[PDB]
Amino acid sequence: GQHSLQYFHTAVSRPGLGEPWFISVGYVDDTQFVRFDSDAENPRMEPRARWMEQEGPEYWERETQIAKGHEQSFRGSLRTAQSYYNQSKGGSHTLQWMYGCDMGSDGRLLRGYLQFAYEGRDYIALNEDLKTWTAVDMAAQITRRKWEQAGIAEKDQAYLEGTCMQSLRRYLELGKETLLRTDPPKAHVTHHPRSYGAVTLRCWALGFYPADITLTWQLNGEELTQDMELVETRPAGDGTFQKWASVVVPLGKEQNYTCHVNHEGLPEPLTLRW
């Protein structure tokens, strides 16, 4: 039972076509719950989870306020990164920021994090100590010295260990019936023609939550690690996830194989054969 509260920020310039595109998303575990989009007629922090709908105006006003502050900083940051890297005018550049806190099973802080990317590349990152930074290049180092001078690490550490953790537990409280739920996979194995003497056994895991799942195909104990096709875990769109794993197998010998579904929401590992 591990949790996390993460906020994602993305600023994409678009010269001659408006102010930078700023969008922010907030996540509790594998569930998005808040969002801000600079292009909305009225940019504001808005709920994206049903359990965040009983928060009242004050809450959003505040968040909307903070989001805008950051939005402005990102406008200036874009222009700044543009200079540090001396990029010509008229170009599009992205600035990304993601920070959050992981909460261990014991309910205590597991660790915090905060990092930036520019043009999709690691730029600057707060180290696991939450006191020092990792600057990727001379440009980043400039930012590093500035943040060191402003004692920003200290501020982030405080937020990451405190406020971040406080709101997480709190949002977990709000989202109880869904955030703490753990919808187990609906697993079945499907059969598929492939060749004249070989079929594809596809092991499906449906409607589970959280997204973390383990699918493996095996033949008499031995895991068929190399013959296994795995699809990236995907959102069904309704809050749960899907995933499957397949193996190429000779016709007539399907029954011999077995797939093992492992997921928090299961009393114990599943074993499917066909």
Binding site: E63, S73, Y84, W97, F116, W147, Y159, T163, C164
Partner: peptide, 9 residues
């Protein structure tokens, strides 16, 4: 809740 600390590059 969003962190209030501004990070200017």
């Amino acid at each position: 809740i969003l962190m209030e600390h501004i990070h200017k590059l």
